[PDB]
Amino acid sequence: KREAQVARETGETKIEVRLSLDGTGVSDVKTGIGFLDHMLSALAKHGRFDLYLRCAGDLHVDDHHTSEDCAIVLGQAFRQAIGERKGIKRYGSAYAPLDESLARAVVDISSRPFAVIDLKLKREKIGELSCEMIPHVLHSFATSANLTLHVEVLYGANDHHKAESAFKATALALREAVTKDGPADAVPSTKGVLE
Amino acid sequence: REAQVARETGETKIEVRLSLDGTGVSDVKTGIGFLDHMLSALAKHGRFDLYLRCAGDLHVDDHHTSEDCAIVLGQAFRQAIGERKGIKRYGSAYAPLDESLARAVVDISSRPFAVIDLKLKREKIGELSCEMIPHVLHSFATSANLTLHVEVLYGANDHHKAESAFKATALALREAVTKDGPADAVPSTKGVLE
Amino acid sequence: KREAQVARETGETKIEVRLSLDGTGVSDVKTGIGFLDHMLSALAKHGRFDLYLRCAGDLHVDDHHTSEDCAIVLGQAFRQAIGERKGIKRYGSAYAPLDESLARAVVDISSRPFAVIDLKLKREKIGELSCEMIPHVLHSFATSANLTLHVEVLYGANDHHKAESAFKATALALREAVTKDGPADAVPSTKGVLE
Amino acid sequence: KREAQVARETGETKIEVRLSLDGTGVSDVKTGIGFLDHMLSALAKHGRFDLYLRCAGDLHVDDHHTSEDCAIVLGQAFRQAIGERKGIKRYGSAYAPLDESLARAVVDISSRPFAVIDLKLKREKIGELSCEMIPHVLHSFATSANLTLHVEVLYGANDHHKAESAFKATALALREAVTKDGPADAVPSTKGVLE
Amino acid sequence: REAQVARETGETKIEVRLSLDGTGVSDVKTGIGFLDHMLSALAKHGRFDLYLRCAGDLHVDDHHTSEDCAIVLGQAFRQAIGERKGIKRYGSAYAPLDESLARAVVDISSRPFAVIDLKLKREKIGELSCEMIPHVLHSFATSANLTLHVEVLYGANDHHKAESAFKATALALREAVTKDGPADAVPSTKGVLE
Amino acid sequence: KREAQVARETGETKIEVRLSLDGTGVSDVKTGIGFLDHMLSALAKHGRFDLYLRCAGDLHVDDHHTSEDCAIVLGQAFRQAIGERKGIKRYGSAYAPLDESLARAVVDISSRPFAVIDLKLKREKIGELSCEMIPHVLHSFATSANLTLHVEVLYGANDHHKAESAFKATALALREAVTKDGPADAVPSTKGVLE
Ligand SMILES: O=P(O)(O)C[C@H](O)Cn1cncn1
Numbered sequence A, C, D, F: 001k002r003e004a005q006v007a008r009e010t011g012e013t014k015i016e017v018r019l020s021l022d023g024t025g026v027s028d029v030k031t032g033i034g035f036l037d038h039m040l041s042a043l044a045k046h047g048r049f050d051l052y053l054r055c056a057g058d059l060h061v062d063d064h065h066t067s068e069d070c071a072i073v074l075g076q077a078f079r080q081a082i083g084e085r086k087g088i089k090r091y092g093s094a095y096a097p098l099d100e101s102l103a104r105a106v107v108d109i110s111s112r113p114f115a116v117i118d119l120k121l122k123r124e125k126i127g128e129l130s131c132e133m134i135p136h137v138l139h140s141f142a143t144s145a146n147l148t149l150h151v152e153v154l155y156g157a158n159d160h161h162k163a164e165s166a167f168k169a170t171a172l173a174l175r176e177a178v179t180k181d182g183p184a185d186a187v188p189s190t191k192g193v194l195e
Numbered sequence B, E: 001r002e003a004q005v006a007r008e009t010g011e012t013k014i015e016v017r018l019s020l021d022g023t024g025v026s027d028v029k030t031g032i033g034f035l036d037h038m039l040s041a042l043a044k045h046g047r048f049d050l051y052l053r054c055a056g057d058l059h060v061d062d063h064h065t066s067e068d069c070a071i072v073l074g075q076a077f078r079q080a081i082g083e084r085k086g087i088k089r090y091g092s093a094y095a096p097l098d099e100s101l102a103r104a105v106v107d108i109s110s111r112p113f114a115v116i117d118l119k120l121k122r123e124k125i126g127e128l129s130c131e132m133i134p135h136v137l138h139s140f141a142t143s144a145n146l147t148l149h150v151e152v153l154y155g156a157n158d159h160h161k162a163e164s165a166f167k168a169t170a171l172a173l174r175e176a177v178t179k180d181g182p183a184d185a186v187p188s189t190k191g192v193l194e
């Protein structure tokens, strides 16, 4: 019932996403970048979202337009799947480790696009995904989802652990934030409106 | 789980009605608009129902009003919980507002204590002095007879910092007073929460 | 009910534990060290675990082999009680204070033994339990339980408050992580296996 | 005969290892990552182990799951091959240089999984093996082998020399630790048990 | 290669029997359990057989007991070696215990000397004062008439540090006293090891 | 028998060396510099080498050409005495103290000439051997022996003790490295060649 399909095409990328918020965690993601597929796969699995994604992008240039545009379209789908912002918890937070790494994510379904991202990534790339694109993906996702997202890797020593723990924490926090809670028609805001 | 408290001194005359198992509605008139907004947010995100009126000595400053509102609110919270059994006891939450992020942690401990760190930079937000904001939280915690930790981890806008703090506090309080497990269990290894 | 009984003996210690994860918080714990007893009693109480433990140890040497071996056996019991790692939340986190002290624990039922522990204890002992054994207990528990455990005392000033807040937080995080959630046969991992 | 065959399958990797502790140094290792194959070949050669390894892994993501899971299975095979922990030296240590680099490894067949690893690598990758995975390999090996491993690169200027000197030292130290020494049934522990 | 030594003062009364070519068995009763554990580890990992009893002045503190036990143990070790010929002379080893790592280096030199650095942080381990731990190793080396270097390179648990140090010492002593090469050869360019 | 003789003459020095690797520690060394004789005598004794050496050198200039050329000739002799690099341990390491001084030596019979030497000598001369010539002797030995040598004085306070502990440690490491071990035809390298 809470789902969305979004298609988007530019000169750089051509993307389709299908998203169900009330899923079982199944993913079929092919961005053209394996490590990004793994991160979005983790996001779906731990968020209990169902996610289908295809991207034909300009990887001959670099991984940037693909990664950013996948995040944009994912964010748009999440926004649409949420629907009217009523009857939900609105706020979610979670910690997820991976071995020595620990990450925290905090989500506010605010209708104010904003993100604060600090992943402490040390390397240049994880597989074929540039580390600089990893915060960019979370920022672009948050702004297109029209929500407020804070993600911090508190510490760690392995960048795959850092990134993955961040996606896992993000997934758990998003899941909590969009959970139905209390009266179905209550807007969870003192101003009575979440656009 | 509702309580009504009335309290009058030479500085302030206050009435509060608080229900723990509400829908978030509030009617809060402290005399200070920003404080009203903070307690409205507390009620909204705690799913508490809160009525509050204060006739206070604002011609002096905002201090006695804000503190006493916190004192009476805390007394009402303590009373509304009633016997400290069958509840989660511990709650914690994060709430942002844009660039600011706050955490609140609550222990329904019967030991009044607060650790508050809001990183507010300004002198006032509207007519509420920034120094009164941690004082409100501390006074609330002590009169509620509980342990409260509130940290603004970072931010750049004092309205965002303060409001994120009240939202996080609301969420943690809601969790801590949630009924969970056997109704008669005291959630303490010492068997007593006074 | 998810329960386990474990008996272990070496030349240093002879220990028996019985643990139920789906308990009411009852404990009957006698390790030979009162403060360790109190910490394990707080663990069971706030975890809603039921815990029986006896240790006949070598306290004439010091508190080390007793404390460590109690953690090993408790960890083994926890691992065995969880049984097949399916149908559970897998991730838990919690904060617990005690007056001026605040602790955070994060749990990942990962089948990867790992612990990151930072308790900020200033004393040599609390009662008859050496402070250096308190992180060792958490690390040994985590590794024998085959899970990932992160425990941090953020701040405080009383070592009994710090240690107890740590065990309380740990309890609450373990309780969340082992809570049944979603389809009973789902393995909460993108790799489909948690051994 | 001190030998083992171990197989392991997840959604990320499918691996088989065959190992003899009392070998001549022969290796047939194909992880999918040439530099890792070279390190493991070195380990077998200088440890006088015989090692066969095959991994079908998710290298399209990155080198992490392959490398980690190869180390996990290798460690498990080591644990099994040692068998009952009696009649062996238990402790091993060795230094190995490669030109300007010098490494030390220390092994304790302890039945307590722990590793302390400090390789001082400066690069992002050596061949297709990410440098961050090299400590992760040694740590995962040690924990799966249920032993205590300390490896330090003391100094050096070339990461291939640093990593290779570390595997060489590890090989020599492991060879020493599992060498039969003294009465066949003596347990090398004051507590009389090494599980 | 066995020796028996008995020593009595107004502080302590000690008997030791030590065999170098043992299986690692021990019966050590110093009156201090953690010291017993360390000397048991020493015997076990050195493949020495060690008997020790001490009736000491533990009402004062652990010092005279611990020191005199090390003194007598060292004297026994010196005597058990006998004429310093046909041995390796030099020994070294590392031993960890979990996060801690120690190194010991032995030279059967007939020059009493020790360099000890265990990085212990606590005041006591059980009833053995941490400051007595290096003193034990030093007093052992001087009475054994040898050169001993023991370093805890790093660690975080003092029982692990001390225990790793005794294990490494044991392994190094075992190597140093191992028979190797012609039985009459003195392992010194000066042709004498007194 | 693993023995060699080398005779070498330049306008600066005239040297004859005879070396046996499988000796009893006997030496007869006359370099012209007593302290250097004492160091090479210690090396022979603790390596269980037999060594004869005579140098007629330009001591009226300084100790340099003598000390370096003795090291060169000795290294050449060591290389010839080893012969085919097969059937040996290849790697050796050792610590030797002398009173307050402690030194570590590590040897790799690598066929790659390289030395890393750090003796921490404070004086100008020990007897008639200039302190700067002591690391020069070790480096020139290693490079002429065609092997990798690392020697460190970890600490100390007496330069005779530091130097002598260094030569003792070197001797012990060299003895271990050239010890016969395993099949006599095996080449102890993954590349199958030690030239
Ligand atoms: O978070 P909201 O939109 O529910 C209500 C806030 O009062 C709005 N706000 C935005 N900046 C400061 N306050």
Ligand SMILES: O=P(O)(O)C[C@H](O)Cn1cncn1
Pocket (backbone or CB within 6 Å): B109, B187, B188, B189, B190, C098, C160, C161, C164
């Ligand atoms: O948190 P409680 O009151 O349930 C039990 C604690 O053991 C009491 N305590 C308070 N300071 C130290 N311990």
Ligand SMILES: O=P(O)(O)C[C@H](O)Cn1cncn1
Pocket (backbone or CB within 6 Å): A098, A160, A161, A164, C110, C188, C189, C190, C191, D064, D065, D068
């Ligand atoms: O957390 P898991 O085992 O469910 C899946 C991870 O992808 C495995 N992993 C372990 N290190 C890096 N990734």
Ligand SMILES: O=P(O)(O)C[C@H](O)Cn1cncn1
Pocket (backbone or CB within 6 Å): C064, C065, C068, D110, D188, D189, D190, D191, E097, E159, E160, E163
């Ligand atoms: O190393 P072991 O297990 O042979 C004997 C040790 O006494 C056990 N131990 C583990 N931590 C402190 N001691």
Ligand SMILES: O=P(O)(O)C[C@H](O)Cn1cncn1
Pocket (backbone or CB within 6 Å): E109, E187, E188, E189, E190, F098, F160, F161, F164
């Ligand atoms: O180690 P030794 O006694 O075999 C021979 C040394 O040369 C003696 N010495 C002691 N200080 C300096 N040299």
Ligand SMILES: O=P(O)(O)C[C@H](O)Cn1cncn1
Pocket (backbone or CB within 6 Å): D098, D160, D161, D164, F110, F188, F189, F190, F191
């Ligand atoms: O140490 P070797 O020559 O047995 C084999 C090495 O792989 C060769 N090498 C030299 N530099 C890097 N590797």
Ligand SMILES: [Mg+2]
Pocket (backbone or CB within 6 Å): F004, F005, F006, F080
């Ligand atoms: Mg010749």
Ligand SMILES: [Mn+2]
Pocket (backbone or CB within 6 Å): A064, A068, A136
């Ligand atoms: Mn961009």
Ligand SMILES: [Mn+2]
Pocket (backbone or CB within 6 Å): A038, A160, A164, D065
């Ligand atoms: Mn992964």
Ligand SMILES: [Mn+2]
Pocket (backbone or CB within 6 Å): B063, B067, B135
């Ligand atoms: Mn006041």
Ligand SMILES: [Mn+2]
Pocket (backbone or CB within 6 Å): B037, B159, B163
């Ligand atoms: Mn506002």
Ligand SMILES: [Mn+2]
Pocket (backbone or CB within 6 Å): C064, C068, C136, E098, E160
């Ligand atoms: Mn221990």
Ligand SMILES: [Mn+2]
Pocket (backbone or CB within 6 Å): C038, C160, C164
């Ligand atoms: Mn307590």
Ligand SMILES: [Mn+2]
Pocket (backbone or CB within 6 Å): A099, A161, D064, D068, D136
């Ligand atoms: Mn990993």
Ligand SMILES: [Mn+2]
Pocket (backbone or CB within 6 Å): D038, D160, D164
């Ligand atoms: Mn190489």
Ligand SMILES: [Mn+2]
Pocket (backbone or CB within 6 Å): E063, E067, E135
């Ligand atoms: Mn003394």
Ligand SMILES: [Mn+2]
Pocket (backbone or CB within 6 Å): C064, C065, E037, E159, E163
């Ligand atoms: Mn011990």
